[PDB]
Amino acid sequence: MWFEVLPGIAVMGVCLFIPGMATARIHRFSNGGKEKRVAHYPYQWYLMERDRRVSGVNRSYVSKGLENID
Amino acid sequence: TYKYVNLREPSMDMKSVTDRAAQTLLWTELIRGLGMTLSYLFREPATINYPFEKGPLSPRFRGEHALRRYPSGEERCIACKLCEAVCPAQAITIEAEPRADGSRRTTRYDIDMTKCIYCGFCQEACPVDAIVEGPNFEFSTETHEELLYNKEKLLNNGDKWEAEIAANIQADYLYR
Amino acid sequence: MFMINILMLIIPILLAVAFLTLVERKVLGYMQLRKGPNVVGPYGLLQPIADAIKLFIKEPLRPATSSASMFILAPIMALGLALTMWIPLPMPYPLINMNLGVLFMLAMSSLAVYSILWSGWASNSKYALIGALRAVAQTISYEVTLAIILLSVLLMSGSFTLSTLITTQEQMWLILPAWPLAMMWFISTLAETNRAPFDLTEGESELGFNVEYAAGPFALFFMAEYANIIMMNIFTAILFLGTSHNPHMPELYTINFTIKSLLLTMSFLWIRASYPRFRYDQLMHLLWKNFLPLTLALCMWHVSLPILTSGIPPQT
Amino acid sequence: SRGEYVVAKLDDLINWARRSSLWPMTFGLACCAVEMMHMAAPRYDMDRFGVVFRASPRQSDVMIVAGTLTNKMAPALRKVYDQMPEPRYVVSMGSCANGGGYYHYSYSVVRGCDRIVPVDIYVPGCPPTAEALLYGILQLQKKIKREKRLRIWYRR
Amino acid sequence: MNLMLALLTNFTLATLLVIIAFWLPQLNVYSEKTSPFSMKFFLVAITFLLFDLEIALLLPLPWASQTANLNTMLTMALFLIILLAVSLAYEWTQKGLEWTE
Amino acid sequence: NLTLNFGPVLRLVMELSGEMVRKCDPHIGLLHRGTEKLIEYKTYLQALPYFDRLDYVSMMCNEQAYSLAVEKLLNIRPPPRAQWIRVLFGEITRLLNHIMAVTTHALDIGAMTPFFWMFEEREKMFEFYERVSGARMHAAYVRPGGVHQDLPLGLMDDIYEFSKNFSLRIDELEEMLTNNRIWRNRTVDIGIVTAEDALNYGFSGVMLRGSGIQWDLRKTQPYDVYDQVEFDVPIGSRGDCYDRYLCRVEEMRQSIRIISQCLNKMPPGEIKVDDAKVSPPKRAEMKTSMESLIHHFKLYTEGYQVPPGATYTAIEAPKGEFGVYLVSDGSSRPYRCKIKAPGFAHLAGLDKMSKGHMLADVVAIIGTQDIVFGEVDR
Amino acid sequence: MELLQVLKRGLQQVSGHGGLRGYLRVLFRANDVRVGTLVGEDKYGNKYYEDNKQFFGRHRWVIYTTEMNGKNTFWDVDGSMVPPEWHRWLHCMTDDP
Numbered sequence A: 001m002w003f004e005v006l007p008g009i010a011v012m013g014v015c016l017f018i019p020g021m022a023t024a025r026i027h028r029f030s031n032g033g034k035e036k037r038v039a040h041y042p043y044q045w046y047l048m049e050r051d052r053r054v055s056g057v058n059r060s061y062v063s064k065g066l067e068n069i070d
Numbered sequence B: 001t002y003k004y005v006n007l008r009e010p011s012m013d014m015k016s017v018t019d020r021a022a023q024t025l026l027w028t029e030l031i032r033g034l035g036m037t038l039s040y041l042f043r044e045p046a047t048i049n050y051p052f053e054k055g056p057l058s059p060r061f062r063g064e065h066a067l068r069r070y071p072s073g074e075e076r077c078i079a080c081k082l083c084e085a086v087c088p089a090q091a092i093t094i095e096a097e098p099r100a101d102g103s104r105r106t107t108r109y110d111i112d113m114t115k116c117i118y119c120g121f122c123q124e125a126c127p128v129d130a131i132v133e134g135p136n137f138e139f140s141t142e143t144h145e146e147l148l149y150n151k152e153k154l155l156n157n158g159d160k161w162e163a164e165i166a167a168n169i170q171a172d173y174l175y176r
Numbered sequence C: 001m002f003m004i005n006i007l008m009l010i011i012p013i014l015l016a017v018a019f020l021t022l023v024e025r026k027v028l029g030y031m032q033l034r035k036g037p038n039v040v041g042p043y044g045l046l047q048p049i050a051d052a053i054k055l056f057i058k059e060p061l062r063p064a065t066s067s068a069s070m071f072i073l074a075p076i077m078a079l080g081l082a083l084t085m086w087i088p089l090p091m092p093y094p095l096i097n098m099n100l101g102v103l104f105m106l107a108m109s110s111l112a113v114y115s116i117l118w119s120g121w122a123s124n125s126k127y128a129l130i131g132a133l134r135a136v137a138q139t140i141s142y143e144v145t146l147a148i149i150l151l152s153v154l155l156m157s158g159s160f161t162l163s164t165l166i167t168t169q170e171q172m173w174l175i176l177p178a179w180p181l182a183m184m185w186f187i188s189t190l191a192e193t194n195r196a197p198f199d200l201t202e203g204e205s206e207l208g209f210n211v212e213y214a215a216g217p218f219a220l221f222f223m224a225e226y227a228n229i230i231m232m233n234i235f236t237a238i239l240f241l242g243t244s245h246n247p248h249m250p251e252l253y254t255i256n257f258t259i260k261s262l263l264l265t266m267s268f269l270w271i272r273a274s275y276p277r278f279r280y281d282q283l284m285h286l287l288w289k290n291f292l293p294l295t296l297a298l299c300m301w302h303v304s305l306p307i308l309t310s311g312i313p314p315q316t
Numbered sequence D: 001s002r003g004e005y006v007v008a009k010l011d012d013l014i015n016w017a018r019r020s021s022l023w024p025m026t027f028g029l030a031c032c033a034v035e036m037m038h039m040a041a042p043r044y045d046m047d048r049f050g051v052v053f054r055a056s057p058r059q060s061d062v063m064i065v066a067g068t069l070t071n072k073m074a075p076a077l078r079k080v081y082d083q084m085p086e087p088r089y090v091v092s093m094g095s096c097a098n099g100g101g102y103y104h105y106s107y108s109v110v111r112g113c114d115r116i117v118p119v120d121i122y123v124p125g126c127p128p129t130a131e132a133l134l135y136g137i138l139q140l141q142k143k144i145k146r147e148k149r150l151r152i153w154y155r156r
Numbered sequence E: 001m002n003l004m005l006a007l008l009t010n011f012t013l014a015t016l017l018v019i020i021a022f023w024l025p026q027l028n029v030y031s032e033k034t035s036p037f038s039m040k041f042f043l044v045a046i047t048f049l050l051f052d053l054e055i056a057l058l059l060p061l062p063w064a065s066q067t068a069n070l071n072t073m074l075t076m077a078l079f080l081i082i083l084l085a086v087s088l089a090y091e092w093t094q095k096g097l098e099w100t101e
Numbered sequence F: 001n002l003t004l005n006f007g008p009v010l011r012l013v014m015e016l017s018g019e020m021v022r023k024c025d026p027h028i029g030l031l032h033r034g035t036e037k038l039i040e041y042k043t044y045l046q047a048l049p050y051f052d053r054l055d056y057v058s059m060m061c062n063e064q065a066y067s068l069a070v071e072k073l074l075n076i077r078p079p080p081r082a083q084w085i086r087v088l089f090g091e092i093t094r095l096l097n098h099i100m101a102v103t104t105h106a107l108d109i110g111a112m113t114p115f116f117w118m119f120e121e122r123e124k125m126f127e128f129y130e131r132v133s134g135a136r137m138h139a140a141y142v143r144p145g146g147v148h149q150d151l152p153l154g155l156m157d158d159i160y161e162f163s164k165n166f167s168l169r170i171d172e173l174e175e176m177l178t179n180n181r182i183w184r185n186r187t188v189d190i191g192i193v194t195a196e197d198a199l200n201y202g203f204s205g206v207m208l209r210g211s212g213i214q215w216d217l218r219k220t221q222p223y224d225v226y227d228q229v230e231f232d233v234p235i236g237s238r239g240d241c242y243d244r245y246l247c248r249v250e251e252m253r254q255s256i257r258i259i260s261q262c263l264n265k266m267p268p269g270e271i272k273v274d275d276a277k278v279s280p281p282k283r284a285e286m287k288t289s290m291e292s293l294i295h296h297f298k299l300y301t302e303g304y305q306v307p308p309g310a311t312y313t314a315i316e317a318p319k320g321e322f323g324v325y326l327v328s329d330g331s332s333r334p335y336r337c338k339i340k341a342p343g344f345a346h347l348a349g350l351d352k353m354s355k356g357h358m359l360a361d362v363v364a365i366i367g368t369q370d371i372v373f374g375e376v377d378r
Numbered sequence G: 001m002e003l004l005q006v007l008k009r010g011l012q013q014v015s016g017h018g019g020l021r022g023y024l025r026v027l028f029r030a031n032d033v034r035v036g037t038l039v040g041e042d043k044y045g046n047k048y049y050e051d052n053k054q055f056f057g058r059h060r061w062v063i064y065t066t067e068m069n070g071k072n073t074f075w076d077v078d079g080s081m082v083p084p085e086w087h088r089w090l091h092c093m094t095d096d097p
């Protein structure tokens, strides 16, 4: 019957699902549980590089807040 | 009597002209075609599960040739060569001689299954129902020689399929 | 971790292409009142694997090519570019977040024409070269409308960033304000990928350029061709059927986005089973005399519409 | 694991791949092509066994000689057999291809396509039913299943 | 760097598949087998090139709408598209978009 | 001009001035088998199967043409029930041909799906063939003097059930083709044939009626019981491939109309001429009567003698006028048997119909002529 | 409603074949998991089923034996293994098994 086509579509659906899921999960793993920072314009990159210097460790995704101010 | 297939005049009123303009720009008749293929997607396919299911046949089916016997085991063929004379492809070669007990029997009965056209004229011309076309249609070989049948092969086919050949003849001899 | 991401994209793309062949043979089968592959594995699930193994252990013809350097370059270019058009796709997060991602996909798609033209030379047959030329004319002609249609849609988006199309469609699908462009974008994707009713290469009794290839190299062109069908239909969903993106549940986007791309991919099989084939001059007159006049007019209407409605999108 | 065991398994894998993906090129010459088209029709649907409906001569794995082969046509049949990548099998469908058939004694007929090309399976009938042809194809799969190329290579 | 890795990976994989596609079957040892310019096609390619050059001038339209000179910008945007339409109209009426000899 | 020896059972030697076609030279004989010469060595009964294999999509129509020719020379008349079966299976066979003609024509130009739908209907008409004769295609059922066997009990019910649902099958074919613009672009104004040229070039069948010529041998020179059934003859107005396509679709509809009447008006009685010097006796009486056994023996060894004479007998076969010029010398074996295939004259006109069209149109023109090379080559 | 009864028919196919193991056996041998009415078994082990709610052609089928004449036919089933007595019934040449 027609529903015997679903097994092929489900496999194709799972295959098309891994690239989206994998990329989203790797970004959060590589960026401390946050989304990867987007720098399309120089201003965004300037802030991101500044975060690298302000974080201590040379990581832009390690954010420092009020506890870092005297 | 006759009828015209393509002799219509398209109405040129504004509504009809706009109906054709919508058909041209909105692809109405093309989507109507997608509807028909969509419906077939949800019908039950007509495919059967061969070899576990087989296509329907009838008692008259003209399959593999075979030689039959009487209920006593005596061969029906008495070497009359009517099948040989009628065979349009000249696929039958027969030789005969008086048997040891004096009966009229064949010492050769070959059907070249690669000259045969499976016409059935042999089973029609036989006066003793000796040569028949049985119901088997699955006997493809791996070599050309295996399709040159002799008397031993044809008799074996009769002994093999006599259970089904007799029932087919019983169900059709009244139409003959 | 980035290298793992690349392979997490490349392998599923090929696997999806492997099982799009099974889906196409079964969706075509049921639309034709039959089943399609259901013997090789449960419901034909192992059919793509059998075909793949069989092709790669069959002797390749490899005739006396004119060059033998364009004979290897062509399949490499075809499959290299097909995989390269996925790296900017947001699903919802791109592998590579390009600012001009939309323009990058147009550029790579235009380079794919060289695969047809290089394999036509390597064929060494004059007739095989004529078929390649007709395929190039069809491909370049129908990417004129892709560029202008894409430009018209971006005037409602505001940039060439692919991930901005997600924001642009956060209240409504772009299929609504731009369904006329959607109709002409969908058909241009069919013509770009040489899909029916625009498949003259496979349109026996008239013409394929990739005919001297067989077994393995043939499978490389086939994988590239079927990888672009998925990619084009993924692009269509992003461009006209945007999916809402919740940053805390990114898998919801992927599930919804995946379903839309499958339905559009199956529409390609739906169309192939329903219509006859265009003549070569008829699909040229479809582009030059029907699509192009409308695409130019709609482009003017879409440059001016945001201005007169005070609805110009943000530059960033 | 012994070498005779690895080679035995590799034979099954390649044998399974080849018999599960038999793409035929059909020489539809005469009436037997109509029965060949009925094997592709919904009733039997050759495509569900992995047998694609129509395949180009440079992608095909088996040639089905379906119809009378005349002298005028014999050179072009050999020309297509020689251009078919290996492994390549040939199936003779019907009496005309088998041994000449109704036209065995004609001045213009090749008395069997097996004097022009090697043949692997003979399907008898005039025409063989769509089911009798499907039996031949399934019989070719079993023939391919018995091949022992790798095992024979390992014993050279 | 990420982009360079992606490009290198895609084409490296494409190359490896091609080489092992021309030689994997050669693991098997099969028996040795032995043994007009058309002016209309050229016109299509040239027309595409010229139409493709006028697209190049239209691509920056999304950025052009951000100016404070919308009256000037909209006037020239419609000028380029209209002349692109006049180019099509000329070939159309001169039998340039035809395939019958 | 570029020359293309396309080659293979059709070889076209064409010279092209770009996209256009300037000269088309069909090369035939790739399926020439000497059918006409072999028949001279066969008795009149042995030669009958040769006519199933000429136009192998319209088997029983070919058998009927040869049966009428021999009966005319024999000066006998098949019984009325045999003539209703021959008309009944004459029109079932027209459906088999037109399904093949319309759907392979559509298959060649890209439309692949209607082929499968209508071949499930062909697979059910092949069961009617196999139930009356035991063969799906080559029945050898229609013979001089009538038919071979009476219809099996329960057959006409199944034909009624089949004919009841078939009009919907055609309607689905037309939902895919008739109004489809892509299909109208491939056929409208393609292969236009003027009425005067069609007559001079020896055309027949839909090739004439598609150009407005009102001619159909079933109505002008009726045979069997075709003057006792009401049906209409489709007539085109433009002479293009689209008009011929519509004609073939409408004939499939008028065939269901004739079939509906053959079932209702099927009479009783014997099914082969009650003249044992032409038709073989019943088997039961062959095994009890001396005269019946002698005639069975002679009819199957020597055959019947046909009085001397020559006739040209033609019928409205699905592909056009199919006829035989049959010469009898007075013996049991025909002296000469020329077969007039409708597709032989149609193909000879491919060079004219294709003048001024593109290469892809030659595929559409060949489909519209409905060419099967079994009858062209013979 | 009918939606829920469809999923129940699928489940009872597993029970109608004798558990999961039997269900998978007929899925990998016969590529079909319908449940029919056992009409009989021949001397070689072939089992013949029927179901008259299926359309003509699919209302009679044979599940071939796993061993015939000393040959292992678990995977290598052949259409010629049906004996003549069951050949006539399985091909709808008669109504009587």
Ligand SMILES: CCCCCCCCCCCCCCCCCC(=O)OC[C@H](COP(=O)([O-])OCC[N+](C)(C)C)OC(=O)CCCCCCCCCCCCCCCCC
Residues within 6 Å of the ligand: B024, B025, B026, B027, B030, B031, C175, C180, C182, C183, C184, C186, C187, C236, C240, C241, C271, C286, C290, C291, C294, C301, F181
């Ligand atoms: C208030 C201001 C509003 C301004 C905007 C106003 C817009 C008003 C509407 C304008 C008309 C709409 C234009 C639509 C495009 C028309 C293209 C055209 O020219 O058609 C004629 C063309 C050809 O027309 P023709 O061949 O019949 O004739 C042309 C003209 N003559 C007669 C002179 C030759 O039709 C086609 O394009 C054929 C399509 C090929 C087959 C494709 C199958 C389609 C299957 C359905 C797919 C559905 C799309 C799904 C999209 C999903 C995407 C997510």
Ligand code: SF4
Residues within 6 Å of the ligand: B065, B083, B086, B087, B088, B089, B090, B091, B092, B111, B115, B116, B117, B118, B119, B120, B121, B122, B123, B133
């Ligand atoms: S079926 Fe016909 S051709 Fe075949 S052996 Fe019998 S009589 Fe001869």
Ligand code: SF4
Residues within 6 Å of the ligand: B076, B077, B078, B079, B080, B081, B082, B083, B084, B094, B125, B126, B127, B128, B129, B130, B131
């Ligand atoms: S098989 Fe029958 S017809 Fe032939 S020789 Fe024997 S008895 Fe005579």
Ligand code: SF4
Residues within 6 Å of the ligand: D030, D031, D032, D066, D067, D068, D093, D094, D095, D096, D097, D101, D102, D125, D126, D127, D128, F053
């Ligand atoms: S074997 Fe029979 S069906 Fe096949 S081509 Fe010859 S005569 Fe025709």
